[PDB]
């Protein structure tokens with residue numbers, strides 16, 4: 162009957178049910194300039210769409226069948242939800258807490274409510290009596306989509322946001338730039354999208370698959386970006402842009418080779434292959450430095466969240482070793498290790514950001530390869546996204562006083578096959594990254610108590626070398642996304658895969674109402 166995902170920290174089931182009727186009154190705290198009333202108004206619209214129930218306002222506790230009260234002692238995303246025959250009572254300290262209480266309230270109702278779809282026939286509406294106290298284990302509960310390899314577009318990304326929101330995920334990491342495409346309009350550099358957002362193959366070549374000649378691509382205008390940011394904010398999802406530099410930058414190099422290429426006399430094209438490119442940005446070129454500053458400036462206007470991801474994964478130094486500007490810069494920073502140029506490039510950008518007014522400053526996230534360099538100049542107010550040797554990298558980050566986010570390739574890359582069946586779509590892996598394998602990863606296993614404060618959370622990543630169509634994206638995303646969401650939210654002691662399996666089965670109905678694809682193996 163009751164199926165909540167993520168499982169709350171504390172749930173007690175009580176006798177009886179709360180019945181709505183067609184109309185009822187709510188009393189809602191005015192905290193923070195009526196912000197909670199605004200959250201509640203959004204909820205009311207959803208509820209009416211799905212059920213026909215109308216909620217009006219009251220100031221009188223005695224008339225309130227739903228009450229949202231401020232409890233400042235609760236954590237920033239925590240809530241209490243008490244459902245009795247007489248009243249629904251919610252307590253929280255911050256808008257996100259109240260929003261999550263209402264997510265859990267929706268999830269206690271038939272699945273059409275969470276889906277935001279009315280039922281064909283006439284229905285009766287109620288809640289089970291419960292006492293819930295809930296709070297997320299981790300503050301960062303993320304999903305990353307690669308749109309550089311294949312582009313999905315606004316409608317599909319809204320569906321991604323919708324999926325994340327079901328499971329209380331709060332961080333969308335937008336991997337917008339790659340060797341094979343650049344997907345975000347930058348006004349000062351129009352060729353990033355004019356050249357970089359189109360290429361002459363849909364498939365990315367690998368093994369026996371060759372380029373297919375199709376004029377393929379797409380990008381987001383700044384208007385598009387602002388729309389998606391606003392859409393996600395309504396669901397308490399913040400967006401982190403990733404401009405992956407100076408590696409994974411062949412599309413940018415193809416757009417502006419005259420100053421971004423290490424070897425501008427050679428040819429530079431958007432890459433049609435899968436793999437790791439050596440065609441990295443010439444970090445020693447002054448126009449490359451200005452380019453990066455100017456891109457960051459435009460990101461700052463589009464993305465209000467306080468973090469930017471600069472990537473830094475899989476960045477070969479060989480083209481720097483062969484470039485005169487780079488050799489000279491390395492000599493001038495007193496080094497014989499070309500990796501240091503990557504760190505210096507970042508230091509310039511970090512310094513630049515520090516010159517800006519406080520509200521324009523951003524904190525930086527990097528893939529963990531950056532930690533292999535001498536990062537001392539960057540200080541410890543950077544964040545390491547741990548993916549390769551993740552457990553060890555996160556521990557090293559924490560030991561250096563850096564925040565860390567866990568996105569281990571195994572098992573949190575949910576583009577990978579989720580079954581060994583021969584009928585699975587083509588993607589990376591053998592089929593070992595089953596729902597169970599995802600759920601069973603324990604992020605803080607054997608992590609010393611003193612390091613744990615630096616572990617900000619977890620993220621599932623979705624790489625799109627092989628994935629070109631929304632149906633396949635969704636098939637691979639779901640239901641593994643929910644396992645990572647639960648890992649991010651639910652206390653480890655309350656996590657149980659067989660229990661999760663029973664609960665997630667109830668969401669097939671939700672997925673079907675929304676027309677989402679999903680793997681059916683555990684269903």
Ligand SMILES: [Cl-]
Pocket residue numbers: 602603604605606653
């Ligand atoms: Cl754990």
